[PDB]
Write an enzyme that holds these catalytic residues in place. Sequence first.
Site, mmCIF file in Angstrom:
data_model
loop_
_atom_site.group_PDB
_atom_site.id
_atom_site.type_symbol
_atom_site.label_atom_id
_atom_site.label_comp_id
_atom_site.label_asym_id
_atom_site.label_seq_id
_atom_site.Cartn_x
_atom_site.Cartn_y
_atom_site.Cartn_z
ATOM 1 N N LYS A 126 22.684 1.649 -27.004
ATOM 2 C CA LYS A 126 23.543 2.346 -26.053
ATOM 3 C C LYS A 126 24.745 3.028 -26.707
ATOM 4 O O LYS A 126 25.350 3.926 -26.108
ATOM 5 C CB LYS A 126 24.011 1.379 -24.966
ATOM 6 C CG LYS A 126 22.889 0.909 -24.085
ATOM 7 C CD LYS A 126 22.068 2.094 -23.577
ATOM 8 C CE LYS A 126 21.522 1.822 -22.178
ATOM 9 N NZ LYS A 126 20.915 0.445 -22.070
ATOM 10 N N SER A 149 14.947 -7.881 -24.914
ATOM 11 C CA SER A 149 14.243 -6.609 -24.780
ATOM 12 C C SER A 149 13.606 -6.210 -26.102
ATOM 13 O O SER A 149 12.589 -5.503 -26.128
ATOM 14 C CB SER A 149 15.189 -5.514 -24.288
ATOM 15 O OG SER A 149 16.307 -5.380 -25.148
#
Lengths: 101, 101, 313, 314
Positions: free
Chosen positions: C41, C272
């Site tokens: 991110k 993830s």
Amino acid sequence: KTVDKLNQKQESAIKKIDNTIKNALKDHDIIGTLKDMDGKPVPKENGGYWDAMQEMQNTLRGLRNHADTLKNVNNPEAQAAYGRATDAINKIESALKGYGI
Amino acid sequence: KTVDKLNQKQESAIKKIDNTIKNALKDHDIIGTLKDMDGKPVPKENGGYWDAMQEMQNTLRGLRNHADTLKNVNNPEAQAAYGRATDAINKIESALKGYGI
Amino acid sequence: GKIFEDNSLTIGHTPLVRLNRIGNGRILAKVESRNPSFSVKCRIGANMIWDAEKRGVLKPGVELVEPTSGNTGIALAYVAAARGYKLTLTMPETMSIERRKLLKALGANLVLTEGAKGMKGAIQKAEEIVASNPEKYLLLQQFSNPANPEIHEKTTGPEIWEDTDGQVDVFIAGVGTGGTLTGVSRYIKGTKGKTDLISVAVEPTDSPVIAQALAGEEIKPGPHKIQGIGAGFIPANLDLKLVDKVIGITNEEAISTARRLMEEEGILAGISSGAAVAAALKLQEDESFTNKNIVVILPSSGERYLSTALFAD
Amino acid sequence: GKIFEDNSLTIGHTPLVRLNRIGNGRILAKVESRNPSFSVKCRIGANMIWDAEKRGVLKPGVELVEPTSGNTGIALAYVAAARGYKLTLTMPETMSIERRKLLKALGANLVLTEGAKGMKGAIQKAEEIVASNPEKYLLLQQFSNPANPEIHEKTTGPEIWEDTDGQVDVFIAGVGTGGTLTGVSRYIKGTKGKTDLISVAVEPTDSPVIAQALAGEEIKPGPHKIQGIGAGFIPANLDLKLVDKVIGITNEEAISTARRLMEEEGILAGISSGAAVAAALKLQEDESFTNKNIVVILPSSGERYLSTALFADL
């Protein structure tokens, strides 16, 4: 074969040395100091947070000072006390040398 | 102007829909599910315990099935129940859509 | 050499590492925790704000606002700190102390919304805040804003291309916003003209909306444990025209494979990251892919998740 | 392009970032948390093991052993995981649960020694373990082992030189093992022949042994809050002939400056990172240094310290 009489100052240094060794060198005093070094005292105070780090510094400074007082004194009782102080300092320094690395 | 009588199956679906809404949808059920999604579920053993995630899945699956049962039924009481189910599903889906990103 | 003028400019050039004990050795893991705030991110925390500057909308007095409970908050927080912006984040009150502490240290203003209202609660409050002074506040909108896939097309993709020397066959990425997947594939398929490339989205089995969407089925999201993906809807920044395939992964598969990345590869990995690698592993069960080069994205480091069930023993 | 064969080969090429709101803009901070296990120690976790391979002592059946309560445990743990070695770490039982978990996930074998015995307890147990089977076990010895300063000379130093294009004036690093300071200075002073360079060690005020050593004073270490430095002795991997100066920093100075790094620069920083930057700040008070280019090392990320006092006020 000379031996000198201890004065109040020196008899005091010997008294304090053995005291701070008994009371301020307990295991939780050392464990506390280590955990304070890791940043987890915990820093909050609900009262009696105790700042083990600060206490342990005072303990060191104290021992180092009494050791200074007794270092060159020609009395064998003073030299035995100087040894006990030196020993205590080495107990503490061995515990925290190289910690956190 | 047609209206059909509900059967046992459909009256059952209407009953279960309103139950799971008061009992299995509570702030503590949604909060619990959110915290399980963050990997931090509450330990045994509490009433209405973990995994809130599994419970909420069971809750979703249940509502979706009853909604299926009541979707095309020509009775107005069924369609009102279908709405309450559809509503509840959207309540839950709005809570967890886009969470953790 | 290089002196970066601020930390937002240090994003990218994450390493591509061969997984030796996981799979057959054709799985190449791009470690995206090697980033200024240590997640994939970081890339859009920078470029979403850069972009807002270039378009001129962000100027003196203007503050940033976004709803996020995830890494995007950390990526926006550090960039706003480095470029001197005021940031306000909305998240549900479910957020832990430690995570709050991390955002505050980065100078973010935190607004905790009502827990039962969940993520929509935060999205609402964010919009209410922009609504109080539409001139003062600026909403970044990570799911819609095209800067998100753009940075992956300008940087992430090129890196995968350059480091593999055009030899990437399959690209695997979990989808939170879809930005990574969209932008990388948009670079490799579009700009380098390799339409051969198989782009694979990874989602949880418990919120399998990409599979539902590719089947024309109704969209039926659910709660899952794979943090960072599984949005529970099809975000605007996921372009399905670029998606060749989607693999669903169970909570247990992700957590177990995350633990394998740390113990067998020495790679700190979050849930993830295990999920995406487990998808690559399932793909190697099909014998058509066994000789193929697989680049998989590894979005975050397990250290961030240290208090969670990711560490059970 | 580049495919790394395992994660240990990804070390280095950490960015050098200008601090804009801290100091006058000549402070350049090398962010060493951009590393595979996210600390400056990643560099020595790798090459301490690489070197062991090259010297041939590390071969089939041989397992790694080191006493450490710090990042060096994390750096050895991930490299042993990536290159397939058995690792055993000794630390006092004071280590938190969460830190234990982090090492176990990386596959390290943890031996917790007696808390009151402290760090010497761990160093002892480590030696006893190697002593039980000297053929099987290999001790890395981060304070003495020359592999430690060597990478900083091979990588850390070269990067600082290249990124600054030879224009670094002052180099500032806190000293845990001394390896960074020693190796970098050894590259810039020795190999590129710039003896002008001012190498500045940073230590805590509460354990100021480098200042004591440079003054010929007796060595008197103490407890401090700056994790990662302040070893409490002069480690063999600290070469004082390269050290031009030493700045002592208070617990509060390091913590407050760490917070400034995160809030004002967007840089996640642990206590030792605040310490080194605060030294650069003290150096700029002297007006002879105000115009000079200062590269300072930033060893770790504050996220690792998230449960500690580094994050206090809500």
